[PDB]
Amino acid sequence: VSTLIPPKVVSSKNIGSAPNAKRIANVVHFYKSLPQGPAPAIKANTRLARYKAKYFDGDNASGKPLWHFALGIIAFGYSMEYYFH
Template sequence: MSFVTRRALSTLIPPKVASPKAIGAAPDALRMQRVVSFYEKLPRGPAPEVKATGLLGRYQAKHFGKNPTAKPIIHAIVFLLVVGYAQNYYFHLRKLPDELLGPKTFRNGCR
């Protein structure tokens, strides 16, 4: 194996954890003991699943999590339609003559 290949593979392989007694020299043994104690303290197994909190976190967990759905696209379309109509009403439709909006008896909830 060439030097370049060994160097490239060494970054993928975690450092070898050996016992400090196998090292031999006292300064290296102390340093190796620190490495061993560090790796012993690391948690084993898969990381626990994080519970989503907040409104946006729960929405993302529900629609973008393990079972993604197309509902966010539908929600975005409905939101844009509502905002678009609200803007259209504010800037244009409220200034129309009363005859175009229908009989006065049914507007504003009055009879």
């Protein structure tokens, strides 16, 4: 008999139902987000970090470190091969 008032009732529930769950999921991660490679930490030195940076990095990612390890184990084992036989 009178005029009910829909057009300003969105205060109680934000428009949409499915994207409401994703709103909180995607709005919160943008605060603590790296602008462009912040704190890359590409430089380190712990007597083995240089080897990791030079060979164990994703830029090369080749089979050369495995061959170097094989050569090193051969060099180490030559001495005890002489010692045993």
